[PDB]
């Protein structure tokens, strides 16, 4: 059997898109720009423009709802105390920066700096300042209350004691924290610094958030470029067509142009619908991650980064969110010789919580995730049966604490 004897604290990163860009297109103005004859001819087609406008309005409302449900997770707004005696941990790299304007953390500033004719765009309902205020409220509430503020009314708790709770939540005794507070604090600070340095150094840090914008821009550009096609008509410009051709014959050309432009609009709207559905799925996943990972501690595997989950902090980003998962991982291990049970006087002793172990001369019992030998007594084992059923049982002596 192999048992670790040391641990490392690691911090990872996760990026998730949340919202798209709200856009609207005037069907009539796009198809026919200030042309009475073109408008009259288009009037004999139906409610296509109305359908497109309704779809786009639905998309915009869906984007607003997505952002609202992702970020508006807290009822009140909390504030960090002016003192910064968090048991030795240093949080200056994620808390809001008061000196610089707009009140954003340095990591948020680095994130923001990295991403840098009938068509209208609507402003988002929530502004960057409000998103930052939500993120700051969530961060301060987490830091000062653990999960109690998400469960119910907020209750204060010292940060070392909260970390002791978290260690107790993954099968490691709080003894370990109370012995290695300084090492754990140093590792946490170093990991935060490394994440800050590496994020700017790596070029493809926000590939998804850049890709969404690139796709939207390319779709808009090709839609606006499609306006300069003949579609089989004499010319692609309506005023010149009207000035050249006769009224009896210009109708065919105008009809061809209308058909082409309507087909282009329909294709664009369908693509927008599909992309919006994908973005909504991503936003739902991000909301679930936030709820189950920031406001609490989760036992699901690889749902909150690699390793055993401890805590995570949220950071805002343009049209997205960023998480900083903090995980526990064993580092340094040896191997020993184990045994399933122990014979004392014809009775079989089994571990209460732990596993038997020996270095070759004496037998002890430890935890499962950290080497810490203890002497074998009646407070570590419980008797069940006799010495004739278990396979591989081993002779030994069990001390009596009485």
């Amino acid at each position: 059997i192999a048992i670790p004897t040391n641990f490392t604290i690691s911090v990872t990163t996760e990026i998730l898109p949340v919202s798209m860009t709200k856009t609207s297109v005037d069907c009539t103005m796009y198809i026919c720009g200030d042309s009475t004859e073109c408008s009259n001819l288009l009037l004999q087609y139906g409610s296509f423009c109305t359908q497109l406008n309704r779809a786009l309005t639905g998309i915009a409302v869906e984007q607003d709802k997505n952002t609202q449900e992702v970020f508006a997770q807290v009822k009140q707004i909390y504030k960090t105390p002016p003192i910064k005696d968090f048991g030795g941990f240093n949080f200056s790299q994620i808390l809001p920066d008061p000196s610089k304007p707009s009140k954003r953390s340095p990591i948020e500033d680095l994130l923001f700096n990295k991403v840098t004719n009938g068509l209208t765009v609507l402003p988002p309902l929530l502004t960057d300042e409000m998103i930052a205020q939500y993120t700051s409220a969530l961060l301060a509430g987490t830091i000062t209350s653990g999960w109690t503020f998400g469960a119910g009314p907020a209750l204060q708790i010292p940060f070392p004691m909260q970390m002791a709770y978290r260690f107790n939540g993954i099968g490691v005794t709080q003894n370990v924290l109370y012995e290695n507070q300084k090492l754990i604090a140093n590792q946490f600070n170093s990991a935060i610094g490394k994440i800050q340095d590496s994020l700017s150094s790596t070029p493809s840090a926000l590939g998804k958030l850049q890709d969404v914008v690139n796709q939207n821009a390319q779709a808009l550009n090709t839609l606006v470029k499609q306006l300069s096609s003949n579609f089989g008509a004499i010319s692609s410009v309506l005023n010149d067509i009207l000035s050249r051709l006769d009224p009896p014959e210009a109708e065919v050309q105008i009809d061809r142009l209308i058909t082409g432009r309507l087909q282009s609009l329909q294709t664009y709207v369908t693509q927008q619908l599909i992309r919006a559905a994908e973005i909504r799925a991503s936003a739902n996943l991000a909301a679930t991650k936030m709820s189950e990972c920031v406001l609490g501690q989760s036992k699901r595997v690889d749902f909150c980064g690699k390793g055993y989950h401890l805590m995570s902090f949220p950071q805002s980003a343009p049209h997205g969110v960023v998480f900083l998962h903090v995980t526990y991982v064993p580092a340094q291990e040896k191997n020993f010789t184990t045994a399933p049970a122990i014979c004392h006087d014809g009775k079989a002793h089994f571990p209460r919580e732990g596993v038997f172990v020996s270095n070759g001369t004496h037998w002890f019992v430890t935890q499962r995730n950290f080497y810490e030998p203890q002497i074998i007594t009646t407070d570590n084992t419980f008797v069940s049966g006799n010495c004739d059923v278990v396979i591989g049982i081993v002779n030994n002596t069990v001390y009596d604490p009485l």
Binding site: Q76, I77, N117, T144
Partner: protein, 118 residues
């Protein structure tokens, strides 16, 4: 020898006058949608109009980032959002009775008491 400029998306945006050689800039004159903000007709019959993305010259006139708002009285308070408009501005029918446009309030201010012993 260049006559008229062009844009990245192939849009005419610069013309030189033939008689007097001089560079001119072309920008289309404003356009935008129109929206009506109303409570339930059962409650009242007074409405407000929001002119989208148009500058308050081409039309109690109030200016926002979303557009030019007509018929709503600005206030200093902050309430929960009722009828969203854009850029953190919401309007509601509140007391006498009229329509008011404000800045939405995220929530109640709070500060938990923290110390290394409590």
């Amino acid at each position: 020898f260049q006559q008229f400029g062009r844009d990245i998306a192939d849009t005419t945006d610069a013309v030189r006058d033939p008689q007097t050689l001089e560079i001119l800039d072309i920008t289309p004159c404003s356009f935008g949608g129109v929206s009506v903000i109303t409570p339930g007709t059962n409650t009242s019959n007074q409405v407000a109009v929001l002119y989208q993305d148009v500058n308050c010259t081409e039309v109690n006139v109030f200016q926002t980032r979303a557009g030019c708002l007509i018929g709503a009285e600005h206030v200093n308070n902050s309430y929960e959002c009722d009828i969203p408009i854009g850029a953190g501005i919401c309007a509601s029918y509140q007391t006498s009775q009229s329509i008011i446009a404000y800045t939405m309030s995220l929530g109640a201010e709070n500060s938990v008491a923290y110390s290394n012993n409590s």
